[PDB]
Design a protein around this motif. Sequence first.
Motif, PDB file in Angstrom:
ATOM      1  N   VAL B 100       0.746  -1.335  -0.070  1.00 50.81           N
ATOM      2  CA  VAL B 100      -0.066  -0.205   0.103  1.00 50.81           C
ATOM      3  C   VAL B 100       0.930   1.243  -0.014  1.00 50.81           C
ATOM      4  CG1 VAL B 100      -0.627   0.204   2.480  1.00 50.81           C
ATOM      5  CG2 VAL B 100      -2.360   1.039   0.470  1.00 50.81           C
ATOM      6  N   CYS B 101       2.219   1.226   0.687  1.00 49.74           N
ATOM      7  CA  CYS B 101       2.921   2.339   0.575  1.00 49.74           C
ATOM      8  C   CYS B 101       3.513   2.464  -0.736  1.00 49.74           C
ATOM      9  CB  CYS B 101       4.202   1.900   1.416  1.00 49.74           C
ATOM     10  SG  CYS B 101       5.349   3.518   1.558  1.00 49.74           S
ATOM     11  N   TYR B 102       4.010   1.693  -1.526  1.00 55.26           N
ATOM     12  CA  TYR B 102       4.380   2.015  -2.901  1.00 55.26           C
ATOM     13  C   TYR B 102       3.291   2.412  -3.764  1.00 55.26           C
ATOM     14  CZ  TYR B 102       8.990  -0.264  -2.904  1.00 55.26           C
ATOM     15  OH  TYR B 102      10.452  -0.915  -2.716  1.00 55.26           O
ATOM     16  N   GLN B 103       2.127   1.891  -3.371  1.00 55.91           N
ATOM     17  CA  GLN B 103       0.843   2.337  -4.210  1.00 55.91           C
ATOM     18  C   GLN B 103       0.396   3.914  -4.133  1.00 55.91           C
ATOM     19  OE1 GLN B 103      -1.134  -2.203  -4.947  1.00 55.91           O
ATOM     20  NE2 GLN B 103      -1.845  -0.766  -3.316  1.00 55.91           N
ATOM     21  N   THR B 104       0.537   4.137  -2.945  1.00 50.78           N
ATOM     22  CA  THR B 104       0.107   5.585  -2.321  1.00 50.78           C
ATOM     23  C   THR B 104       1.433   6.608  -2.719  1.00 50.78           C
ATOM     24  OG1 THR B 104      -1.123   4.607  -0.424  1.00 50.78           O
ATOM     25  CG2 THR B 104      -0.655   7.072  -0.517  1.00 50.78           C
ATOM     26  N   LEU B 105       2.582   6.257  -2.778  1.00 51.85           N
ATOM     27  CA  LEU B 105       3.700   7.100  -3.172  1.00 51.85           C
ATOM     28  C   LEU B 105       3.284   7.418  -4.665  1.00 51.85           C
ATOM     29  CD1 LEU B 105       6.792   5.659  -1.616  1.00 51.85           C
ATOM     30  CD2 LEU B 105       5.634   7.951  -1.287  1.00 51.85           C
ATOM     31  N   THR B 106       3.092   6.525  -5.606  1.00 50.12           N
ATOM     32  CA  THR B 106       2.723   6.526  -7.091  1.00 50.12           C
ATOM     33  C   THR B 106       1.667   7.664  -7.203  1.00 50.12           C
ATOM     34  OG1 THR B 106       3.717   4.461  -7.549  1.00 50.12           O
ATOM     35  CG2 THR B 106       2.223   5.140  -9.089  1.00 50.12           C
ATOM     36  N   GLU B 107       0.547   7.458  -6.344  1.00 53.02           N
ATOM     37  CA  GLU B 107      -0.318   8.584  -6.718  1.00 53.02           C
ATOM     38  C   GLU B 107       0.228  10.000  -5.897  1.00 53.02           C
ATOM     39  OE1 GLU B 107      -3.656   7.504  -3.638  1.00 53.02           O
ATOM     40  OE2 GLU B 107      -4.770   9.255  -4.858  1.00 53.02           O
ATOM     41  N   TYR B 108       1.190  10.419  -5.253  1.00 56.24           N
ATOM     42  CA  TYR B 108       1.805  11.637  -4.992  1.00 56.24           C
ATOM     43  C   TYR B 108       2.994  12.016  -5.646  1.00 56.24           C
ATOM     44  CZ  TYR B 108      -1.993  11.659  -1.474  1.00 56.24           C
ATOM     45  OH  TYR B 108      -3.038  11.375  -0.604  1.00 56.24           O
ATOM     46  N   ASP B 109       3.442  11.226  -6.637  1.00 54.98           N
ATOM     47  CA  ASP B 109       4.687  11.183  -7.424  1.00 54.98           C
ATOM     48  C   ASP B 109       5.201  12.499  -7.847  1.00 54.98           C
ATOM     49  OD1 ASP B 109       6.946   9.847  -8.861  1.00 54.98           O
ATOM     50  OD2 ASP B 109       5.873  10.462 -10.655  1.00 54.98           O
ATOM     51  N   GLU B 110       4.078  13.379  -8.646  1.00 55.97           N
ATOM     52  CA  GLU B 110       4.435  14.652  -9.272  1.00 55.97           C
ATOM     53  C   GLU B 110       4.862  15.449  -7.821  1.00 55.97           C
ATOM     54  OE1 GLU B 110       5.182  15.880 -12.214  1.00 55.97           O
ATOM     55  OE2 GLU B 110       3.388  16.092 -13.251  1.00 55.97           O
ATOM     56  N   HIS B 111       4.140  15.645  -6.783  1.00 59.82           N
ATOM     57  CA  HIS B 111       4.645  16.553  -6.035  1.00 59.82           C
ATOM     58  C   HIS B 111       5.830  15.960  -5.191  1.00 59.82           C
ATOM     59  CE1 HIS B 111       2.643  19.374  -2.525  1.00 59.82           C
ATOM     60  NE2 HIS B 111       3.786  19.846  -3.057  1.00 59.82           N
ATOM     61  N   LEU B 112       5.937  14.844  -4.818  1.00 58.05           N
ATOM     62  CA  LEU B 112       6.977  14.347  -3.848  1.00 58.05           C
ATOM     63  C   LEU B 112       8.246  14.586  -4.777  1.00 58.05           C
ATOM     64  CD1 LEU B 112       5.526  11.288  -2.280  1.00 58.05           C
ATOM     65  CD2 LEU B 112       6.189  13.469  -1.487  1.00 58.05           C
ATOM     66  N   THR B 113       8.200  14.377  -6.200  1.00 59.96           N
ATOM     67  CA  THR B 113       9.475  14.340  -7.149  1.00 59.96           C
ATOM     68  C   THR B 113       9.998  15.890  -6.892  1.00 59.96           C
ATOM     69  OG1 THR B 113       8.718  12.754  -8.727  1.00 59.96           O
ATOM     70  CG2 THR B 113      10.465  14.454  -9.298  1.00 59.96           C
ATOM     71  N   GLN B 114       8.783  16.786  -7.176  1.00 60.44           N
ATOM     72  CA  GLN B 114       9.460  18.159  -7.110  1.00 60.44           C
ATOM     73  C   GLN B 114       9.901  18.603  -5.449  1.00 60.44           C
ATOM     74  OE1 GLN B 114       9.611  20.212  -9.856  1.00 60.44           O
ATOM     75  NE2 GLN B 114      10.919  21.008  -8.431  1.00 60.44           N
ATOM     76  N   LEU B 115       9.159  18.107  -4.567  1.00 57.22           N
ATOM     77  CA  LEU B 115       9.655  18.476  -3.278  1.00 57.22           C
ATOM     78  C   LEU B 115      11.012  17.938  -2.896  1.00 57.22           C
ATOM     79  CD1 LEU B 115       6.470  17.881  -1.204  1.00 57.22           C
ATOM     80  CD2 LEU B 115       7.626  20.313  -1.483  1.00 57.22           C
ATOM     81  N   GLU B 116      11.174  16.711  -3.325  1.00 59.49           N
ATOM     82  CA  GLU B 116      12.730  16.143  -3.136  1.00 59.49           C
ATOM     83  C   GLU B 116      13.802  17.016  -3.885  1.00 59.49           C
ATOM     84  OE1 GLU B 116      13.422  12.009  -3.907  1.00 59.49           O
ATOM     85  OE2 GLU B 116      11.176  11.479  -3.578  1.00 59.49           O
ATOM     86  N   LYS B 117      13.553  17.405  -5.132  1.00 63.53           N
ATOM     87  CA  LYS B 117      14.303  18.173  -5.844  1.00 63.53           C
ATOM     88  C   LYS B 117      14.532  19.625  -5.086  1.00 63.53           C
ATOM     89  CE  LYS B 117      13.530  16.163 -10.394  1.00 63.53           C
ATOM     90  NZ  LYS B 117      12.526  16.047 -11.378  1.00 63.53           N
ATOM     91  N   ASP B 118      13.658  20.245  -4.724  1.00 66.80           N
ATOM     92  CA  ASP B 118      13.522  21.706  -3.954  1.00 66.80           C
ATOM     93  C   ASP B 118      14.307  21.577  -2.897  1.00 66.80           C
ATOM     94  OD1 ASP B 118      11.751  22.547  -5.935  1.00 66.80           O
ATOM     95  OD2 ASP B 118       9.984  22.404  -4.783  1.00 66.80           O
TER      96      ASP B 118
END
Lengths: 7, 133, 132
Positions: B100-118
């Motif tokens: 469920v963790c991996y599935q839910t991360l895939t759902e917030y992918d766009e935002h999380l990718t950007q935050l990681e970068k920032d």
Amino acid sequence: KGGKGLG
Amino acid sequence: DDDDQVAFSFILDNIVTQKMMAVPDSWPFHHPVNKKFVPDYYKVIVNPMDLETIRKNISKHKYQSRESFLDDVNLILANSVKYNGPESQYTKTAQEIVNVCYQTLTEYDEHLTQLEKDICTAKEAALEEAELE
Amino acid sequence: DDDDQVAFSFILDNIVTQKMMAVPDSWPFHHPVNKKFVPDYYKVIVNPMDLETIRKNISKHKYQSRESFLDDVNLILANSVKYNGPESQYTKTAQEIVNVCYQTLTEYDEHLTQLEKDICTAKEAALEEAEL
Ligand SMILES: [Ca+2]
């Protein structure tokens, strides 16, 4: 207890 | 604290409480193994992990990336495979929490990718600014 | 007229959550045993009990006095004595849960005595009401 430690 | 890390940690906590902790019969994974109940456990398992520990780590902003978060989530499963065996019911539950963790991360992918970068960019930026003063 | 029942159940629920559930590392006692994880539990144990079950019972006003509540609390220890043995660390935690419950009930003893009497009196006035 039960199934714990079975591996 | 810093806005982007606060935002990234807010999303990770929602994944743990909203999804991972709601897996049925997942409660034995919600806190650290009691060494008094399971004296063997801390002898065998080199890196204990549980969902309370992950929430405290989130609250302390340990995780700047999805990969560091997943390292700790995946350890919950690896520890159960090792202690309880790979086909054991405890391990089936752990696999459900990982899935469920991996599935839910895939759902917030766009935002999380950007935050990681920032967050990465800001760190190198503070070291560059300190160099220039 | 269930004001006194409501107040009594409110005190018991707070003993469960603030006192009994707060015994350290006592998580296993907060949920029923699921046979998938302890497949032999119900060979041995007839009547399972846990603190989430007691909370459900209190929410439905199962207990009108301390005696019925304590039957369920004490069942948690009796089951650990039988399944885990009297000197198991699980039993040692169940005995801390029972002892903090008795200790707390003794602190609130005169108020709980009074609520227990008023629960019985409300019921009686209603039975007399209903009877005629
Ligand atoms: Ca003893």
